[PDB]
Amino acid sequence: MIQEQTMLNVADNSGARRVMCIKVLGGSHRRYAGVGDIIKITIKEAIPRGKVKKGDVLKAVVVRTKKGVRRPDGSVIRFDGNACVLLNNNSEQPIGTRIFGPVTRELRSEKFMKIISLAPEVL
Amino acid sequence: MIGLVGKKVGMTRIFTEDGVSIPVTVIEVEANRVTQVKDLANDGYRAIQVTTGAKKANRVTKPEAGHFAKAGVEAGRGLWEFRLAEGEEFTVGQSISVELFADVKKVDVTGTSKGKGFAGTVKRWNFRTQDATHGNSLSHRVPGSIGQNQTPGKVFKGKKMAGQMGNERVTVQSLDVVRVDAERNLLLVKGAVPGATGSDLIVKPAVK
Amino acid sequence: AVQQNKPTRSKRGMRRSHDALTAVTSLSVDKTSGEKHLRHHITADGYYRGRKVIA
Amino acid sequence: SNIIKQLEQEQMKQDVPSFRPGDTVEVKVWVVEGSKKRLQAFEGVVIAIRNRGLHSAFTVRKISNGEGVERVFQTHSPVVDSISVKRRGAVRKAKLYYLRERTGKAARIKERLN
Amino acid sequence: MRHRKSGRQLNRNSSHRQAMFRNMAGSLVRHEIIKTTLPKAKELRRVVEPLITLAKTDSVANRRLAFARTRDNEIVAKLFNELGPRFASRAGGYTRILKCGFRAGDNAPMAYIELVDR
RNA sequence: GAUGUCGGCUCAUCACAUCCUGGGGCUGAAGUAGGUCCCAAGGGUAUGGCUGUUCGCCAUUUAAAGUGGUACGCGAGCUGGGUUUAGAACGUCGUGAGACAGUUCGGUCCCUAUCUGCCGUGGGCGCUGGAGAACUGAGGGGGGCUGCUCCUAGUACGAGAGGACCGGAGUGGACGCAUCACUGGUGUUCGGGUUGUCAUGCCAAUGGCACUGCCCGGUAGCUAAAUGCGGAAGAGAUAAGUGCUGAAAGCAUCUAAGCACGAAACUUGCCCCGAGAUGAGUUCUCCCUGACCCUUUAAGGGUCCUGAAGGAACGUUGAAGACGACGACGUUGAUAGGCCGGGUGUGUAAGCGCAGCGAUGCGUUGAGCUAACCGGUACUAAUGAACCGUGAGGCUUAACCU
RNA sequence: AAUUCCUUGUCGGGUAAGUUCCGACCUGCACGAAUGGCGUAAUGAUGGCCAGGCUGUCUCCACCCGAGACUCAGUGAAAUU
RNA sequence: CACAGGUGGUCAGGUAGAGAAUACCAAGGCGCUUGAGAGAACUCGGGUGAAGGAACUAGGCAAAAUGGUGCCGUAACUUC
RNA sequence: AGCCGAGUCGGCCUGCGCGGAAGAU
Numbered sequence A: 001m002i003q004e005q006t007m008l009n010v011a012d013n014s015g016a017r018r019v020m021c022i023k024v025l026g027g028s029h030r031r032y033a034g035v036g037d038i039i040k041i042t043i044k045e046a047i048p049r050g051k052v053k054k055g056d057v058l059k060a061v062v063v064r065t066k067k068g069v070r071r072p073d074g075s076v077i078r079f080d081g082n083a084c085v086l087l088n089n090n091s092e093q094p095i096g097t098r099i100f101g102p103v104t105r106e107l108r109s110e111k112f113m114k115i116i117s118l119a120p121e122v123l
Numbered sequence B: 001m002i003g004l005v006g007k008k009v010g011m012t013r014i015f016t017e018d019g020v021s022i023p024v025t026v027i028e029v030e031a032n033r034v035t036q037v038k039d040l041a042n043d044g045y046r047a048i049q050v051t052t053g054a055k056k057a058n059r060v061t062k063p064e065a066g067h068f069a070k071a072g073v074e075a076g077r078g079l080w081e082f083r084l085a086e087g088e089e090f091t092v093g094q095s096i097s098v099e100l101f102a103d104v105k106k107v108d109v110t111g112t113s114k115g116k117g118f119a120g121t122v123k124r125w126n127f128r129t130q131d132a133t134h135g136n137s138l139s140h141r142v143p144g145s146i147g148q149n150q151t152p153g154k155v156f157k158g159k160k161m162a163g164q165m166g167n168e169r170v171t172v173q174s175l176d177v178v179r180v181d182a183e184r185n186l187l188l189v190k191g192a193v194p195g196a197t198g199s200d201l202i203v204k205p206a207v208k
Numbered sequence C: 001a002v003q004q005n006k007p008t009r010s011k012r013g014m015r016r017s018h019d020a021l022t023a024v025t026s027l028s029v030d031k032t033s034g035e036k037h038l039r040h041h042i043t044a045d046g047y048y049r050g051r052k053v054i055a
Numbered sequence D: 001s002n003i004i005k006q007l008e009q010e011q012m013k014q015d016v017p018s019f020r021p022g023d024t025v026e027v028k029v030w031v032v033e034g035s036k037k038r039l040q041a042f043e044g045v046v047i048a049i050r051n052r053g054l055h056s057a058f059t060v061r062k063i064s065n066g067e068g069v070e071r072v073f074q075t076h077s078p079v080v081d082s083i084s085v086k087r088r089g090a091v092r093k094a095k096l097y098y099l100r101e102r103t104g105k106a107a108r109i110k111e112r113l114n
Numbered sequence E: 001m002r003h004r005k006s007g008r009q010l011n012r013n014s015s016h017r018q019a020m021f022r023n024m025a026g027s028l029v030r031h032e033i034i035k036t037t038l039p040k041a042k043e044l045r046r047v048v049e050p051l052i053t054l055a056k057t058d059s060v061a062n063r064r065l066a067f068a069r070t071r072d073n074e075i076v077a078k079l080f081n082e083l084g085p086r087f088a089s090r091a092g093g094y095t096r097i098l099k100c101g102f103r104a105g106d107n108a109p110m111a112y113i114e115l116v117d118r
Numbered sequence F: 001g002a003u004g005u006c007g008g009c010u011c012a013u014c015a016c017a018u019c020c021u022g023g024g025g026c027u028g029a030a031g032u033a034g035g036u037c038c039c040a041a042g043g044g045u046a047u048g049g050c051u052g053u054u055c056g057c058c059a060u061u062u063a064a065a066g067u068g069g070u071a072c073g074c075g076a077g078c079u080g081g082g083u084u085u086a087g088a089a090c091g092u093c094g095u096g097a098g099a100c101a102g103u104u105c106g107g108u109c110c111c112u113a114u115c116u117g118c119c120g121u122g123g124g125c126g127c128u129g130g131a132g133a134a135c136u137g138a139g140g141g142g143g144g145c146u147g148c149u150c151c152u153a154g155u156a157c158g159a160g161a162g163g164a165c166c167g168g169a170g171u172g173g174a175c176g177c178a179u180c181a182c183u184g185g186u187g188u189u190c191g192g193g194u195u196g197u198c199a200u201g202c203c204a205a206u207g208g209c210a211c212u213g214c215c216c217g218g219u220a221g222c223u224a225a226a227u228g229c230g231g232a233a234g235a236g237a238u239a240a241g242u243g244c245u246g247a248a249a250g251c252a253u254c255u256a257a258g259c260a261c262g263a264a265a266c267u268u269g270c271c272c273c274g275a276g277a278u279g280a281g282u283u284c285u286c287c288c289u290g291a292c293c294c295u296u297u298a299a300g301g302g303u304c305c306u307g308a309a310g311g312a313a314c315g316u317u318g319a320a321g322a323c324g325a326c327g328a329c330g331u332u333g334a335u336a337g338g339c340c341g342g343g344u345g346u347g348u349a350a351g352c353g354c355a356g357c358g359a360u361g362c363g364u365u366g367a368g369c370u371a372a373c374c375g376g377u378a379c380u381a382a383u384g385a386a387c388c389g390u391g392a393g394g395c396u397u398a399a400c401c402u
Numbered sequence G: 001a002a003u004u005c006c007u008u009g010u011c012g013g014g015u016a017a018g019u020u021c022c023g024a025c026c027u028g029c030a031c032g033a034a035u036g037g038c039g040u041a042a043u044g045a046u047g048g049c050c051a052g053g054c055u056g057u058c059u060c061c062a063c064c065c066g067a068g069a070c071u072c073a074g075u076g077a078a079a080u081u
Numbered sequence H: 001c002a003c004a005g006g007u008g009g010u011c012a013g014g015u016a017g018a019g020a021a022u023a024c025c026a027a028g029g030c031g032c033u034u035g036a037g038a039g040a041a042c043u044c045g046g047g048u049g050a051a052g053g054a055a056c057u058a059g060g061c062a063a064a065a066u067g068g069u070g071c072c073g074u075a076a077c078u079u080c
Numbered sequence I: 001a002g003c004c005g006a007g008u009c010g011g012c013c014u015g016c017g018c019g020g021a022a023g024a025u
């Protein structure tokens, strides 16, 4: 459950540390984003010599949340924080070369197979 | 086609081998007994009347008892009616069981909803509340404005206001039939249906 | 908010047309002492349904 | 209700081992990827149990690759293949939510050894 | 809404309710017949009858529980020495309610309540 | 001898000179994508930074972020930032008291609803002997939105670059109804930990007060963030528009006589109310089968005998409820409380024994306690009776039985 | 600028986006030297602007504990017409 | 008005506590001159809240938050 | 006029009609 003004951590090595959500894409009057959805962000903190700078505007996809995901038998999976991966504004492909932390099987689509393949564990 | 009368028992789940959990409502359907057939010559339309259940002797008035004794069936707890299509025929005294839904795939269920009593506009119509601070004065859940000035000078008919909510007839359409059990008189459908545990339900094949 | 015209005695009566009291339908008779009482209540001497309860 | 009890008891497992809050357990689950099926393992500490007949459940917490994860399992689902107890723990409470704010040495649990 | 709920509020708060019913249970055990309002009499059964059920098995633990719930050693002694043996072979229903008239000061409905072997 | 004036919030209703979706003619219309005019009002039609702002500029979305009327809609519905009292200061004008559609800081928003109107819910009488049920449908309301991906097909079109109509399948946003099986919130009526102080003679064990003293968990019920379902397809008559046959006018012409197509607008199909529809409708069952007197002689009055079918009143009460109303039950009985067995929650009671100098630990022991839940059981309370409601149901004409 | 009409002047900083804020320029409509000019540590229920923590202020409301409103018995007003 | 307002001086017990603060008690004094039921909307005074955390608003208005003693350690500027 | 046999062309004056014609309970 991610909305405007929400702050997130970064699960890749592109240089950013903390980011903020400024829009939930999709349709008119849309409220929340969950795992697998694409949002618009601005960068609030970055390390010195990375591939991105503080103040840029880009896109991102959500990979972990504190609310979790349900499964077809009623089970749940929850995490301790909120994290995302940075994408290119036009192509919508990753910017880094590595992935940190676990991810889930909701990402198993033709669009995010690079992330699935670079991840260290898929729950 | 015709339908049947039953009682709401409760809710549970069914597990499949693939690993899916289906939520289900359990409906008990005993045998429905035909009390009267209405035809075009004597009544003006084509239908049947049915009863189900049981009733105690010292609660049945003489008019009702005579009506049952004409048909030759035991007394039940109520009377209901169903319209006939072209090509359907039944006779007085006949019994209809839940095996009627053996090949049906989707049904519609009708019942009476739970009663909330006198309700406000926030709960009854989804109105928005006004501010809880910033100088509001005794107006936190109140409805607001209800009209205009000298023109038109009145309140229009059909306006949304506070009043009684619930306790009325409701229909829910196109529910999947999950199981039919004839030995224990059971029908299992997917999803929720109106009413409380122990209330009466009417089940028909889906119209769309 | 107050009236603009004075209401009439006819209106007063029409409003009060729902104010009459209802009397008790009948009383019961105890099977031993013969007293009259309100149904499901005890009598003034201390009987109920034929037995003495309060002395 | 007798009717619902009868419908429910014909779907229950009878192999479930006995475990308590504070124990360490390993759970094996089914994973489908294409036309293949395999078993994947999840191991951790038991913080909560819900005893509700066919509707029973339990909750497991672990630290994975620098991140804390929690899973809520429905006890009688055919997705779960097997449950095993690896260690027995000694606590006082029925719910162990206070472990969410502890890390490292401050999160240790004593062994029961009864 | 109050669907499926149990209990009476009586225009009080919880501490006041608890203290009042403690005192009333003591009075009923002491005298064996009292006069009060009908709703109060109907509430009093659910406080008094479980104490009589408890007093059918004599032990230090049960006496201490009764003391916790009454705070009167005379009441405890009467329970365990007299009222348990008297009701040893009865399954529930130790009290009885009889409706009487209306109170003069405020028109409240009234009732007597008593033990069934007085 | 008083009609409260800007902007915001809450809640709306109408027009069509149409912003989106629907149907068409022309094009300096190859395709994709555009320009202009005609028909069409069913549904839909952004969040933020700045400023008192309505506007406006800027950032990022959307199929689209329409234009106007309603005391520039709405203060006996809310606010009080701006304007427009009394305090004080700057610049400017005046000798001065003072002044400025110039600026700056501060500055009391009253009313218990008689009548109309609107949302809900009852009492009376009527419908022509009385009573218990099931219906028909004149009429009225609700609902009607739309994205992206895949196949057809890299086909039609095009030098290339690009790239379809028509027709099928899946998955979403916003909105509406119901429900509590699952995930969770609450749960001062259930269990436990602990600080200060007072009491039960004292130890041990317990209770009162300090926001439920402060906290940690949690049953039933209620509930959204939870999970099921919905908008249609078909039919009739048409709008702009497209046509067939065919004269007036030997040719031509969609029209004058005849015949065929055509849209989210109209009438139906889907859901709910509905015979006070005074034009008061229909079907099934049940109940009542005695004697007299008077008078102004008639839809007249009275006296004895008789009191049905059913209804109401009273009590025990409900997932029904402001009060009325509605549903279940009253010994030929499971309606409520209690009682017995389970389940659920909390988490190893008290007493006693052992180890230790002691705070504490171990055994008896997953122990004790356990609300509103499930399955059972006449222990307590639902009394015999009294009360209301009658005794075969008007006149005229027609058609069949006698 | 507590002073500037034109005016949200032009340039730099801070934000994804700043008619307010901070630093400069001088074209001062209409600053200026005891109806004082320019600075200043400490002090202020004083005016303006930005951050950390924190939250039912808000997306968007849900449940609970108390006092009224509702029903019965006793007493018993007001404005207005 | 048998009115939640105003009115100078003296006396000073116990356990915690810096204390005449605050909590619980002693001597002593009181339950405040309409009651009884029910458990709707709305208003008044309070307790708890998934995920987010000023997105509200003229303005963080109101709420939430910090809070004791002993010790370590503490910047620009300054009339020292 | 079209591919044989009686009418046909267009200006003027005048009576009644048709289009031009979009609004808010």
Ligand SMILES: *C(=O)[C@H](CCSC)NC=O
Pocket: F084
């Ligand atoms: C004009 O200045 C304004 C007119 C009011 S007329 C009701 N008054 C301001 O005080």
